[PDB]
Design a protein around this nucleic acid. Structure first.
Ligand code: MG
Ligand code: MG
Ligand code: MG
Ligand code: MG
Ligand code: MG
Ligand code: MG
Ligand code: MG
Ligand code: MG
Ligand code: MG
Ligand code: MG
Ligand code: ZN
Lengths: 106, 131, 62, 107, 100, 50
RNA sequence: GUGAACAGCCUCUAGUUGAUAGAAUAAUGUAGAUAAGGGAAGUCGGCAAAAUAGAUCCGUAACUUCGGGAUAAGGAUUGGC
RNA sequence: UUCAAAUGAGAACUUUGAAGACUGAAGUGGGGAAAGGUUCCACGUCAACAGCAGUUGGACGUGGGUUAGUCGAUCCUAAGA
């Protein structure tokens, strides 16, 4: 019915390599998650938190991992990281940001 | 230039002008004459069942009624609303005979306009009653 | 080099049409060495041969 | 002499009146002739991305104006009949209007 | 910049005739990664450290095969008909010497 | 045809075994006058007529 | 998908990109179009083209083996929201 | 139809990649019957042939490949012989 689902994103690798900002990513999620068809209507329905390496979204109102991936890819495209960083699933409802395969220059 | 427009708007296939139709609808005597036409063997429906707005003869009263219940007739009626756009309008737009154009516009607004509207309303109710 | 046979084997092994297999233009010698479906499977595994995605036919306007 | 410039080519007047199946191939040939005229090289090589830019709107939809980067460089191969060749690249810009010939500072 | 990005994406995309290649299957170069991140303005210290560690890990060590057979070829008389060692040659098996 | 009789397949096997050029050592024999296979058959040139 | 529709037109899966090429754009051809005013004066002959066309509604003669003729003829209309 | 690379003495015509198109499921897709008989596939390879070309080929040279109690024939009868 309204059972709270938890979705986790691990941003540790891009954050450590210095091309990603978890606080900005969480703020983008807060400002761009839609509830009942509108933004800014997350009151007592969904919550987004970040501790510098893991971003957690706890939702009771129609949130899906595909939607979270769509929003994250929008954010990466906006910050011009879509060609280098991708959003992948490790287990159910836990995801990570990974780099695409890059050969050394030598 | 293209064949459709050429064979529709050939000079020998020309139709009556909107300002002429407006002059016909403005005066009550003209409307009465167009409503009571002499029997002509060369016209569809023996000269009866004539739509004044579209200037068009129908073969039957049912055909005239179906024409009145249509968008083409509504299009012509909407076209026949405002100023008839004679040559004085283009002259005034160029800056020529501006006072004459203004006098014509105020005459249409004051006297010719409402009389034409009342004639149209009487014609509409007459057609609705008889059809 | 002539990679027609390798292209056909890659299509058969991946299970798509020949229009949907991409052979790396830089690994020409490595692809030319591959004469068996086993070697083709190895090339697919290491990424020298890639399966293309289907051309989209969206139904949004429909 | 190694050099690199950016030009605008007017393909509209060059393709004026050309049969529809031949417009994009004739644009390719006109670009080769343009580079030969401006650089003095018989050997002209077009980038595949430039070929994509030419053919982007099909065989008969070639753009009126294209912004090109032409680089005259040395031919490293000894067996080649010429010591210099031109390489033509596309310059993707907001609009190809109002642009003049410029020299690109190679670094 | 927005118009330029529109033009670049239009030149890149050809979606009506086929799909775009998957990034998760393709591989790219650290030089392009460095230049793009430098354009974006990030700090390339950690990425350069990763690339240097990978380059120092990928070491080419020569072996006895490289010493002996490195430049040579053949070692086998190449047959005129491209036959295997134990394959019959209908045409040439009856003539032992190459002069004949 | 795919479903053929054994007699037809036997004649086909004989034709296949006959389809060859001359061996090269034939050309080296004393007083040899056979210089090519004058009865060579090809599938697209002369039909076997069953 | 459109559409009454295995029609025509566009697309996905799959399959092709084969048929000597390049350069110019004279006359005459082959194939395909447009044309002021008139409207068969052309020609043995309206040959050929043009015009008509789907669907809804109104309406439909002589003759007739009463079953037809008939989509007779002749009219009004058609989009989007 | 076009671009770059590879191969090669030599590339409009071969291979890969990049593009533009087409068949549009009554197909230029996927299988079979008659007929053909190795044309299938690999390696080598260009004298002749592919009405231009050719490094390519259904071409030339050398080999590999067709596995059934259940699929067919075989059995039954039809017109008939
Ligand atoms: Mg012309
Ligand atoms: Mg005319
Ligand atoms: Mg006459
Ligand atoms: Mg005459
Ligand atoms: Mg009749
Ligand atoms: Mg067609
Ligand atoms: Mg099509
Ligand atoms: Mg020839
Ligand atoms: Mg073959
Ligand atoms: Mg053979
Ligand atoms: Zn009317």
């Amino acid at each position: 019915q309204k059972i709270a689902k938890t979705f986790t994103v691990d941003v540790s690798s891009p954050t450590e390599n210095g091309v990603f900002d978890p606080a900005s990513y969480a703020k983008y999620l807060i400002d761009h998650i839609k509830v009942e068809g509108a933004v800014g209507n997350l009151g007592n329905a969904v919550t987004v938190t970040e501790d510098g390496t893991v971003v957690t979204v706890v939702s009771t109102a129609k949130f899906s991992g595909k939607y979270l991936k769509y929003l994250t890819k929008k954010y990466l495209k906006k910050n011009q990281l879509r060609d280098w960083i991708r959003f992948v699933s490790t287990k159910t409802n836990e995801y990570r940001l990974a780099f695409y395969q890059v050969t050394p220059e030598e | 230039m293209g064949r459709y427009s050429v064979k529709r708007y050939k000079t020998k296939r020309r139709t009556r002008d909107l300002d002429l139709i407006y002059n016909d609808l403005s005066t009550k005597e003209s409307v009465q004459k167009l409503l009571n036409q002499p029997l002509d063997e060369t016209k569809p429906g023996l000269g009866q069942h004539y739509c004044i707005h579209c200037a068009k003869y129908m073969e039957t009263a049912i055909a005239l009624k179906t024409h009145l219940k249509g968008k083409v007739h509504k299009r012509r009626v909407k076209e026949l609303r405002g100023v008839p756009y004679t040559q004085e309008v283009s002259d005034a737009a160029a800056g020529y005979n501006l006072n004459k154009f203004l006098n014509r516009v105020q005459e249409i607004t004051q006297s010719v306009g409402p009389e034409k509207e009342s004639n149209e309303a009487l014609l509409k109710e007459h057609l609705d009653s008889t059809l | 080099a002539n990679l027609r046979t390798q292209k056909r084997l890659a299509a058969s092994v991946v299970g798509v049409g020949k229009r949907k297999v991409w052979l790396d233009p830089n690994e020409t010698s490595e692809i030319a060495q591959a004469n068996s479906r086993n070697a083709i499977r190895k090339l697919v595994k290491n990424g020298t041969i890639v399966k293309k995605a289907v051309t989209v036919h969206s139904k949004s306007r429909t | 002499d190694v050099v690199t410039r950016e030009y605008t080519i007017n393909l509209h007047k060059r393709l004026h009146g050309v049969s529809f199946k031949k417009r994009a191939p004739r644009a390719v040939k006109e670009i080769k002739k343009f580079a030969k005229l401006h650089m003095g090289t018989d050997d002209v090589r077009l980038a595949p991305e430039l070929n994509q830019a030419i053919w982007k709107r099909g065989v008969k939809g070639v753009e009126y104006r294209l912004r090109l980067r032409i680089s005259r460089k040395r031919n490293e191969e000894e067996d080649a009949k010429n010591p210099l060749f031109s390489y033509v690249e596309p310059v993707l810009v907001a609009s190809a209007k109002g642009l003049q010939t410029v020299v690109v500072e190679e670094d | 910049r927005q118009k330029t990005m529109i033009a670049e994406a239009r030149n890149r995309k050809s979606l009506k005739n086929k799909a775009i290649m998957p990034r998760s299957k393709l591989t790219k170069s650290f030089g392009k990664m460095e230049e793009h991140m430098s354009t974006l303005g990030h700090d390339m210290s950690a990425l350069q450290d990763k690339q240097n560690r990978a380059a120092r890990k990928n070491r080419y060590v020569e072996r006895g095969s490289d010493v002996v057979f490195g430049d040579q070829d053949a070692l086998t008389a190449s047959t005129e008909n491209g036959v295997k060692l134990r394959q019959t040659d209908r045409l040439l098996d009856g003539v032992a010497d190459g002069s004949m | 045809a795919a479903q053929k009789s054994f007699r037809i397949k036997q004649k086909m096997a004989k034709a296949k075994k006959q389809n060859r050029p001359l061996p090269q050592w034939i050309r080296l024999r004393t007083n040899n006058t056979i210089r090519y296979n004058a009865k060579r058959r090809n599938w697209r040139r002369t039909k076997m007529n069953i």
